[PDB]
Amino acid sequence: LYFQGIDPFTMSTDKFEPVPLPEILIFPNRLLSAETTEKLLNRVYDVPHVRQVNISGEGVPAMVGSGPGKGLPVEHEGRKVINVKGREIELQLLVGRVFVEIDDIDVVEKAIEAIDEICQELLPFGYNLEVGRYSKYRPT
Amino acid sequence: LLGLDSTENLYFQGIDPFTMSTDKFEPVPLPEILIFPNRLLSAETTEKLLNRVYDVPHVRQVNISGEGVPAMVGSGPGKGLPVEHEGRKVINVKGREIELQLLVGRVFVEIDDIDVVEKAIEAIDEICQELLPFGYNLEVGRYSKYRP
């Protein structure tokens, strides 16, 4: 079937305006240490067409299921400082998500292959990569 | 040879190119509505927002991202002083007690079907108008898994 409608992810509608820049999303199978985060961000910023890299800790801590502290959250991690392309970044939490903004939809495929090669080396415990494409709600 | 170029710009109009590489990318059926508050949310506002969002029809799951907060703080010669509850806050969402450890900057609301997103985003917009007076932006996201 040859589509004849309008997709709000790729064209303006009366309710949506496409966000030009996609994300490459990294979902590691284990949280990232400060050191891993530092190496990952430095390497990813060297990939052509990467505009910015953002990170997040988890919203909800890990709960202790056995031993001392059972039933309670793990002890909160300590603050760490990393150096990304000469800028100091303070980490309050182990990193569970990475968001990589790419400067053009057309180069996503190449960018994600490059990022995949980095992750193969740095995230031996496994990970998943996704492309996110967005549209802004702008009614009327 | 203007005039005799190939016509992929017409044939593929409105399609994102990477999506045609089905050897490498698998479409994710379920979209998300994203809430981007203009300020990082307090635990109190996060709690209110999550309670209301979980009542919107067709919401499947809700995730959050944002900025961590220290569990130790100090301005003296010694080590940091520990913050009560390790700096985290307990919130109550639909009867569940949840330890929150982010100032929230992005809410990810998974919707069960692209076809119901319009009505869902209208309900979420009404919530945000009420709960986020400092302003916010809403977006929809569609995902593709890289599976080379």
Residue numbers in the entry:
A (entry chain B): -9 to 130
B (entry chain A): -18 to 129
From the primary publication:
We present here the high‐resolution crystal structure for McrD from a human gut methanogen Methanomassiliicoccus luminyensis strain B10.
Methyl‐coenzyme M reductase (MCR) is a multi‐subunit (α2β2γ2) enzyme responsible for methane formation via its unique F430 cofactor.
